From a paper:
Here, we investigate the function of [name] ([name]), a poorly characterized member of the ULK family of serine/threonine kinases that is predicted to contain tandem MIT domains. Furthermore, our biochemical and structural studies show that the [name] MIT domains bind tightly to IST1, an [name]-III subunit required for cytokinesis. Finally, we show that [name] phosphorylates IST1 and other [name]-III proteins and that IST1 phosphorylation provides an essential inhibitory signal in the abscission checkpoint, thereby ensuring proper coordination of the final events in cell division. MIT domains bind short motifs within the C-terminal tails of [name]-III proteins called MIMs (MIT-interacting motifs), which become exposed and concentrated when the [name]-III proteins polymerize.
[name] residues 372–446 form the characteristic MIT three-helix bundle, and the IST1 MIM1 helix binds parallel to MIT helix 3 in the groove between MIT helices 2 and 3. The N-terminus of the MIT domain (residues 360–373) forms a short helix that packs in the groove connecting MIT helices 1 and 3. This helix has not been seen in previous MIT domain structures and is expected to interfere sterically with the binding of canonical MIM2 (and MIM3) elements. The [name] M434 residue is central to this interface (red), which explains why the M434D mutation inhibits IST1 binding. The additional binding energy appears to be contributed by N-terminal IST1 MIM1 residues I350 and F352, and by the central F359 residue, all of which make hydrophobic interactions that are absent in other MIM1-MIT complexes. Binding of the bulky hydrophobic IST1 MIM1 F352 and F359 residues is accommodated by complementary small [name] MIT2 interfacial residues A415 and G408, respectively. Charged or polar residues are found in equivalent positions of other MIT domains such as VPS4A or [name] MIT1. These interactions likely explain why IST1 MIM1 binds tightly and specifically to the [name] MIT2 domain.
Author numbering:
A (entry chain A): 12 to 98
B (entry chain E): 5 to 20
The structure:
């Protein structure tokens, strides 16, 4: 089980968090598709905004740690993609 | 400790 699968399972009781994670999942799928780069960036930006506030709202615990790790990774993926697009 | 200052800076930069 990946960290992401586990985060999703810990989020089973929190629809807003699941939904933001699904938008992030769509971003990553778009990054793999021909012509998908701008859609990926838009999905990354939107999900990240939501996830940052959800992270601020999260009480301390394993789910917060997983969410922080995922947010850092998503931000880095989006940053790298943005640089690739800028060329 | 989460560095929200770093994350908020990076987020504004990304958004453009
Ligand atoms: Co929204």
């Amino acid at each position: 089980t990946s960290a992401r699968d586990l985060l999703r399972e810990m989020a089973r009781d929190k629809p807003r968090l699941l939904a933001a994670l699904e938008v992030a999942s769509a971003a990553m799928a778009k990054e793999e598709a021909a012509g998908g780069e701008q859609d990926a960036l838009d999905l990354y930006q939107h999900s990240l905004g939501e996830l940052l506030l959800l992270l601020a709202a999260e009480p301390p615990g394993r789910r917060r740690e997983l969410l922080h790790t995922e947010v850092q990774n998503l931000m880095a993926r989006a940053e790298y993609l943005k640089e690739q697009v800028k060329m | 400790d989460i560095d929200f200052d770093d994350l908020s800076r990076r987020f504004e930069e990304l958004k453009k």
